[PDB]
């Protein structure tokens, strides 16, 4: 995390406009669709057989909202991501057994989702700040792996 004050304001400004419920479902759905191998963690979610089956799955939507919820909180502690995400890092490792590479894929998908949503407002420099943020979060989420 090397975020300039002006980078931090930019992240925060945009995030103000996001509908976490909605973005959460879109980001998670898209992950499962672009990188189908990631579906390995959700066999209890039911039908993920087609893009529509994934995107509209009430379980994917609810999970996505949960994930982005935790993420939004991360955005208020940009100062202490490791601390913020420590119990979650442990859970993902020890209980869920989620390969941390999954956290980077989602970060990239999220960036595409924000671009999709904000159009021209998601400028080159706004993207650069968000790139730093998703990487910091992925790193914080992987810090407790062992």
């Amino acid at each position: 995390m090397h975020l300039t004050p002006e980078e931090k304001s930019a992240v925060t400004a945009l995030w103000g406009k996001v509908n976490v419920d909605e973005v959460g479902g879109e980001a998670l759905g898209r992950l499962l669709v672009v990188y189908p191998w990631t579906q390995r963690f959700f066999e209890s979610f039911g039908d993920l057989s087609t893009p529509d089956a994934v995107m509209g799955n009430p379980k994917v939507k609810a999970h996505g909202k949960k994930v982005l919820g935790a993420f939004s909180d991360g955005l208020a502690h940009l100062d202490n991501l490791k601390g913020t995400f420590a119990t979650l890092s442990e859970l993902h490792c020890d209980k869920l057994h989620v390969d941390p590479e999954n956290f980077r894929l989602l970060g990239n998908v999220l960036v595409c989702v924000l671009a999709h949503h904000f159009g021209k407002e998601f400028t080159p420099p706004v993207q650069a700040a968000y790139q730093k943020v998703v990487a910091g979060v992925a790193n914080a989420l992987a810090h407790k792996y062992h």
Partner: protein, 141 residues
């Protein structure tokens, strides 16, 4: 491999890019320079300033190559041979950088084609850029 579906998806989305390909190519480069500064090591000879004519010029070139790969979606290895040779033998760009540009290309399209940038299209476009990348890196060793 690219399925019939993927091919349709790609031709369709690229179809919409049309005459903007050049500008979108340039924008993808700028996004890449800003988000992944290590990619700049390959353009020490470029003016990487905002609105650089060099970047503009280079964006067009990249866009033309992509447009050429869409036009020859069934014979990419041959349609891109020349470019594959250049990259392998002269430019010698480390393979990891391809994934970085691909990513910034996806961001650019997303930002410009909201109606077409569906999950299905997104997936197809990602698989496409991965294929282009694989071709360009095929003769590295």
């Amino acid at each position: 491999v690219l399925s019939p579906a993927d091919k349709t998806n790609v031709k369709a989305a690229w179809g919409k890019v049309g005459a903007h390909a050049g500008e979108y190519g340039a924008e993808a480069l700028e996004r890449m320079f800003l988000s992944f500064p290590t990619t700049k090591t390959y353009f020490p000879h470029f003016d990487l300033s905002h609105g650089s004519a060099q970047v503009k010029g280079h964006g067009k070139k990249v866009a033309d190559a992509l447009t050429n790969a869409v036009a020859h979606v069934d014979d990419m290895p041959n349609a891109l041979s020349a470019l594959s040779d250049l990259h392998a033998h002269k430019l010698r760009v480390d393979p990891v950088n391809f994934k970085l540009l691909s990513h910034c290309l996806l961001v650019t399209l997303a930002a410009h084609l909201p109606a077409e940038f569906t999950p299905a299209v997104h997936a197809s476009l990602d698989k496409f850029l991965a294929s282009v990348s694989t071709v360009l890196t095929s003769k590295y060793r």
